[PDB]
A paper describes a structure:
BfmR is the response regulator of a two-component signal transduction system (TCS) which propagates the signal from its corresponding sensor histidine kinase BfmS and acts as a transcriptional regulator. Phosphorylation induces an equilibrium shift favoring the active conformation, which includes formation of a 2-fold symmetrical homodimer involving the α4-β5-α5 face of the receiver domain. This homodimeric conformation facilitates the effector domain to bind DNA and modulate transcription.
The crystal structure of the receiver domain of BfmR was determined, lending insight into putative ligand binding sites. The space group was determined to be P65, with symmetry-related reflections scaling much poorer in the higher-symmetry P6522 space group (Rmerge, 8.6% versus 35.2%, respectively, to 2.10-Å resolution). The final refined model possessed a defining electron density for Lys6-Thr125 for both protomers, plus 181 modeled solvent molecules. Moreover, the divalent cation (Mg2+ or Mn2+) required for autophosphorylation was not observed in the electron density in the cleft neighboring Asp58. Predicted binding hot spots exist at the homodimer interface and the phosphorylation site.
Residue numbers in the entry:
A (entry chain A), B (entry chain B): 6 to 125
The structure:
């Protein structure tokens, strides 16, 4: 009965390294690399939390938020290299509960994931 | 029926400038400058959200957080110059829902406040 995390990240190698670390810290973690696939997968699998990049093939992160939010109310943590002020404000306003700059220290990501899961 | 914000910040001038900005954006905002006073004030006034610095006289931000949490369940956004990885993890683990580095752009702070209020 571990918390289920879905990592949505185009960088396959980065996604996996992040996945392995979170798994080592009491989380069950899956990885999706396509934005359109993420929308379908998030709605059907209903992860406890989504770690979401803004830049994605198929559908970008902002579009992923808009499309899943009517059917998915769990925390979404945006994790991206798109770190300008406008980008951050826009992500949050579109439905992300957090917006984190890459590269993120593993422990910091874990702490933010835990804090979000705490308020559900 | 505006959201009520309490800013807890030792820099009186910075606190006021931040207060004025948030007020201009549909928030009711108060300012507290002492950690010990903040604990009493947060518990009794029950703000909809607290903007909380780590560095405070009387009682530090982590202590304030620790002390109010059994009697205060609303969002706490830590806003501080204490930006080390360990500091961030500790703040979140202590009960903060967000942890933001100073100086923060006004629009970004507003967005984070709204996202946090959204999750109640």
């Amino acid at each position: 009965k571990l918390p289920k995390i879905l990592i949505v990240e185009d960088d396959e190698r980065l996604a996996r390294l992040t996945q392995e670390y979170l798994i080592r810290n009491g989380l069950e973690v899956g990885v999706e690399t396509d934005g359109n696939r993420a929308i379908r997968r998030i709605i059907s699998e209903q992860p406890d939390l989504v770690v979401l990049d803004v830049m994605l093939p198929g559908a970008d992160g902002l579009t992923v938020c808009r499309e899943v939010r009517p059917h998915y109310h769990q925390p979404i943590l945006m994790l991206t290299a798109r770190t300008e002020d406008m980008d951050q404000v826009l992500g949050l306003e579109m439905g992300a509960d957090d917006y984190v700059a890459k590269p993120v220290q593993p422990r910091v990501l874990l702490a933010r994931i835990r804090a979000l899961l705490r308020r559900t």
